[PDB]
What we know:
This is part of a larger assembly, with chains A, B and C. By secondary structure, chain A is α+β, with helices and mostly antiparallel strands. Chain A is 11% helix and 28% strand. Chain A contains four helices and 16 strands. By secondary structure, chain B is an alpha+beta fold. Chain B has a five-stranded mixed β-barrel. A two-stranded antiparallel sheet of chain B has the order 1-2. Chain B is elongated. Chain C is an all-beta fold. Chain C contains no helices and seven strands. In chain C, a hairpin with a 6-residue loop joins strand 1 and strand 2. Chain C is elongated. Chain C starts with 66 loop residues before the first strand and ends in a 13-residue tail after the last strand. Classes of the chains: A alpha+beta, B alpha+beta, C mainly beta. The interface between A and C is small, with 3 and 5 residues. Chain B binds four RNA strands through strand 1, strand 2, strand 3, strand 4 and helix 1. Chain C: Keywords: Acetylation, Citrullination, Cytoplasm, Lipoprotein, Methylation, Nucleus, Palmitate, Phosphoprotein, Ribonucleoprotein, Ribosomal protein, RNA-binding, rRNA-binding. Chain C: Belongs to the universal ribosomal protein uS17 family. Chain C: Its main location: cytoplasm. Chain C: GO terms for molecular function: rRNA binding; structural constituent of ribosome.
Amino acid sequence: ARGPKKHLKRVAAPKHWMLDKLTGVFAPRPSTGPHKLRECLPLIVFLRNRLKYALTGDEVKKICMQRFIKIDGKVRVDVTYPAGFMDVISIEKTGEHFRLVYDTKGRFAVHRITVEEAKYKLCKVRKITVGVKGIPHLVTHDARTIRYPDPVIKVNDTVQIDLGTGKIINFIKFDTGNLCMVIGGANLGRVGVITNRERHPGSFDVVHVKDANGNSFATRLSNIFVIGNGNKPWISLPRGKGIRLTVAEERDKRLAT
Amino acid sequence: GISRDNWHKRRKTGGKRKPYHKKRKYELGRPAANTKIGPRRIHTVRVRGGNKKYRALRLDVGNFSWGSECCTRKTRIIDVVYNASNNELVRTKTLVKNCIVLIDSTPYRQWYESHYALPLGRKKGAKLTPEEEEILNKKRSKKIQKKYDERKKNAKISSLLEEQFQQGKLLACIASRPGQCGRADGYVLEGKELEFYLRKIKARKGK
Amino acid sequence: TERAYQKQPTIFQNKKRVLLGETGKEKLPRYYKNIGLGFKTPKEAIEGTYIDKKCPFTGNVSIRGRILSGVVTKMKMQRTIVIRRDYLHYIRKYNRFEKRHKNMSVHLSPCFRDVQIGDIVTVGECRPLSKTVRFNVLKVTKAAGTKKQFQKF
RNA sequence: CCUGGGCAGGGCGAAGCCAGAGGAAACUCUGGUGGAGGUCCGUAGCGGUCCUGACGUGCAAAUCGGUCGUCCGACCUGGG
RNA sequence: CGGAUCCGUAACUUCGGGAUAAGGAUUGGCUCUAAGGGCUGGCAGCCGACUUAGAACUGGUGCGGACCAGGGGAAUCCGA
RNA sequence: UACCUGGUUGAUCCUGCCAGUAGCAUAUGCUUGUCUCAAAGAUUAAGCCAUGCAUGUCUAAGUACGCACGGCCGGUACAGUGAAACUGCGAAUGGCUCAUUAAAUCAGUUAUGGUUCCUUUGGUCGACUUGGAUAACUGUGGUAAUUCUAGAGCUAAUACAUGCCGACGGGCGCUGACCCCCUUCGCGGGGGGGAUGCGUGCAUUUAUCAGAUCAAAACCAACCCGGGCUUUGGUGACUCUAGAUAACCUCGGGCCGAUCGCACGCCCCCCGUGGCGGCGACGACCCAUUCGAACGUCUGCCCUAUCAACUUUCGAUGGUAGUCGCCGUGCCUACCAUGGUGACCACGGGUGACGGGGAAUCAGGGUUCGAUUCCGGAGAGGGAGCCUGAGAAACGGCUACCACAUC
RNA sequence: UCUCGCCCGAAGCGUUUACUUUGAAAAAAUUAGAGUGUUCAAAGCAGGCCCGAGCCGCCUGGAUACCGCAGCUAGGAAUAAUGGAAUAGGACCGCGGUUCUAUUUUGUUGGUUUUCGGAACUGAGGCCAUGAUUAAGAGGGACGGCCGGGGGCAUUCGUAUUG
Ligand SMILES: [Mg+2]
Ligand SMILES: [Mg+2]
Ligand SMILES: [Mg+2]
Ligand SMILES: [Mg+2]
Ligand SMILES: [Mg+2]
Ligand SMILES: [Mg+2]
Ligand SMILES: [Mg+2]
Ligand SMILES: [Mg+2]
Ligand SMILES: [Mg+2]
Ligand SMILES: [Mg+2]
Ligand SMILES: [Mg+2]
Ligand SMILES: [Mg+2]
Ligand SMILES: [Mg+2]
Ligand SMILES: [Mg+2]
Ligand SMILES: [Mg+2]
Ligand SMILES: [Mg+2]
Ligand SMILES: [Mg+2]
Ligand SMILES: [Mg+2]
Ligand SMILES: [Mg+2]
Ligand SMILES: [Mg+2]
Ligand SMILES: [Mg+2]
Ligand SMILES: [Mg+2]
Ligand SMILES: [Mg+2]
Ligand SMILES: [Mg+2]
Ligand SMILES: [Mg+2]
Ligand SMILES: [Mg+2]
Ligand SMILES: [Mg+2]
Ligand SMILES: [Mg+2]
């Protein structure tokens, strides 16, 4: 059409938002933010559809400008502000520190963490460059551009970030033996140790990963998030290791209840 | 309503393509501005995206870079010779991206005197122009340093550039687009390109 | 030599060599670009004479995207040739194939001599050079028969 | 019938000949070259369609001005 | 309309024609540019003809400037 | 539901079609008690529209002397609600239709290193307040009337402009007065310091220079120490990013606050007539992300030969340079070469052809639709041009032509 | 190959497909299909529990399958065509001569030369079991004893009909 799109349909909505068909016609379209439309989750969906805090969206629109809900330290005035993977959601009154990790089904799974871990945050480097007066800049996939990062940071790394100061700490290199978590594709939410990377000159490379009890998968570089350091995850992940066993094993779990 | 589009063209074979667009906005075409050699006159052009484009309708001053010795001074534009694409634009005197400008060699003479002393182009008189040619007297060892610059490096600007400086004009190639940035920025023809364009202009004047 | 109005890609010519006075060799100031991709730069681009704006080893033509292969058919077009890609098409109803081919024009760099008709050539995607030329000749593989034999006169 | 004389320039472009291209062959196509013809416009020449023009006791007991047909020939013409 | 240059040419047909079919554009002056040649020495140098094409400037849209000079088309009858 | 039946003959068998059979989706006849859903001017006419609506918006935070209301309220401008107008954003989304469109849109897969990008999110953001103008307002008018407007007075800011302090002056490039040591009668030669003056930072536009995979000596001329020492990053790749060199930085002129609100305390001190100023709305030069666009790369489309060669003076194919465009492009221009496609169906026609995800049909293979709620494209009676704006050739924007059509 | 840190990793890398089996691959809705008593069902993604209101409370779903053809990656070598050596201009091994380039080291800088790593060319010999699957109840060609009213040209004979 002409210019950018502005609405979004419930039928054309992505699957991982858990929207209905009978409820409404238009879907909540997230605003422009640090994450794309296919890898985000709106705050109106987080507060209305998932956690059952408000029945309508107007109550969420009222409270987000009543200045309670903040993302990563600062308060968001937008009812449809986009979030992403590995974010800290805290609201100011009780112990409610929700981590947006991925479920085995691929959904945004809630994870109430303690304040000492909620102070910290991991983030993946998107790219690295140099700029004005020859200083190094680092672009994060969470749209964080930081200057003078470190000299020992590869492009595909995961560095811990402090939300109170805006400072990076404790980088880890992309090496065989690191615990990663797949964020995109048909196998998202898959947690496994990086086993073998295979390079290809056609601008895309593949990575075979393995995990516990004898399982292996493969994915692409644009969907890998390093979460651990030698089978030691920096962030505690809910519901076991986040392993997809089998649909029949899920049925056995439901029969075991 | 100038359309630089490609949907009104023929295919690989030559089959006539059926028109269905209406020459939309994202394929603008603006008319050409023949850049004359009058005074400095540059108008503005709005660009898609909020940018500004400086359309030079006619220009007087210019910026040109000497090639070998790595110097650059201001230079008045004199004459347009040998467009090498459209010879009608030579007579029209239109400044384009690849054209030849006659540099007035006077703003290079001060730098050549100040760094490359005992200059040339002084009509073989050796009496005229009390410029500060010999007033500063070159007291310290920078006289010896200028002797290294003048005799050890030897400062050869041999017979082609010699005759050009003794005729008082220099042949320059433009290196920028005058209709886009409003600047007639270019460089000085040197060596192989110098003798090539000199041969072309000499043939154009001869036959 | 040159038969155009100007041929000088990037390299500045004069190194102000007039210090004693000598002609010397002039083929040393030549721009040398490696395309990468595990493909060897030929020696014609090293010790050649040509100047080409649209050469992948000389000009600013970046090689990206897809890599395909074809067979050279014609030569009469200047500094660019026409290839043919024979392929089959699986059909779901009748459950067998059919021959289809689509001729494309491709930019033949003048460094690749012995470009005789019938050889398997490799092409690569680049930026659009002209209206019909989009690929670029990348590696000449086949000798197009036996070059050892010779005929009468 | 014999014997002599004469007919400005252009247009159309036949046979033959040369070169190139397509095809498996039969053969086909393209650019020149050539100068053919009771061939076209048209002058001199020969006749006289129309104005039923001018005269019409005229220049003339059949002529003149335009408009004409043909002009390499079944052409016009002197002398015997 | 009429000369010349450049496009385009129908019905029919004995395949030769019709055809200058019909229908459009340009045509002046003054400047240049390119191309088409000859003769000497073991590629270089000297000497001249009228043609074509392109471009610029300009004159009151004016240009075959006088003169030279095909109105065209659709049909019927007769005589090739 | 892997399914048949009757009909040529006096009778039989066979090919063969016709007719009965069952859904599907359009219309229609008759009938109709409840309830959950539910399509609905597509087929003909993308034909024409009366009437009524569908796009407006104000926070403690841009501009309040509105003539409207009231705070107590004394006076040292200003508090509250505040109609309206200046300003900014949006009206380039949605909704509606499928008339054109046959590798064209689309669908699967790849990239801009060949571009732009509102707005959000990050880095960057190093003179005690300057000048005209103007709306609302008040009077004053015109014609039969429109979202018609000029003329007289004044007023405001994030309207438009002009424009300053800090801040020590660091370092570098080139000239450059002066100054130290050795040798030489001097001249001269060699090594080491250095007051003035002109240019500086990020972007724009040039040109140049240096920039990564590997380890042993033998001779001649100069010098540091107790025979012996010096280095930006990434891609598969760069004319990538980043340094240094000399200059432009374009009057239609890039930036480096001549903003606003909150709760309010503290300090050096000679009065505060000065600082300690914490949080929050505006973009502002640039770089990334996000939303989206764009031309691109391979593959895939109904019927037709009573459509066999097509394109090329108004590019058909390619090259060399240039113009325009945001960028690569015969997109355009000048010259040069004669190329490019096709019987594997080129080119030309028709489609009652928008392309798909899908729908109907029950062995399998298929056949027929898909205008329609989701993605993308096209259009606002036909079709051309354009302002604003980041985004339009927009039509609930404008200008002109044709066909309609109102006072 | 151990140059890269007796084996592994990495790298030389495919002559290029057709065909196959994994893996990523995309967008939902729709289709098949898990669970759920919407009163069954069409549906929809919901709900299930403890508690006499007093646990200012828990648990779970909103999957999977298909997504032709086209493209990318990793194995397979059976069928289907293609590459080799015939005028040898064939592949390896180590030696002759010509020529070029970059950086390690002579404590550092400037000049000359060698060794070294590599590219290009030439001359000589050895090393290869030194190089050609045999000839389809496939086909083309040659031979030589025939064959037939096969075809063309010329010539001769035959009776009958008519005059
Ligand atoms: Mg729309
Ligand atoms: Mg002359
Ligand atoms: Mg005749
Ligand atoms: Mg005639
Ligand atoms: Mg006639
Ligand atoms: Mg007569
Ligand atoms: Mg007469
Ligand atoms: Mg008469
Ligand atoms: Mg009379
Ligand atoms: Mg006549
Ligand atoms: Mg006549
Ligand atoms: Mg005649
Ligand atoms: Mg007719
Ligand atoms: Mg006729
Ligand atoms: Mg009749
Ligand atoms: Mg007759
Ligand atoms: Mg029957
Ligand atoms: Mg039937
Ligand atoms: Mg052209
Ligand atoms: Mg249609
Ligand atoms: Mg079915
Ligand atoms: Mg089926
Ligand atoms: Mg689109
Ligand atoms: Mg598109
Ligand atoms: Mg539109
Ligand atoms: Mg609209
Ligand atoms: Mg409307
Ligand atoms: Mg016998």
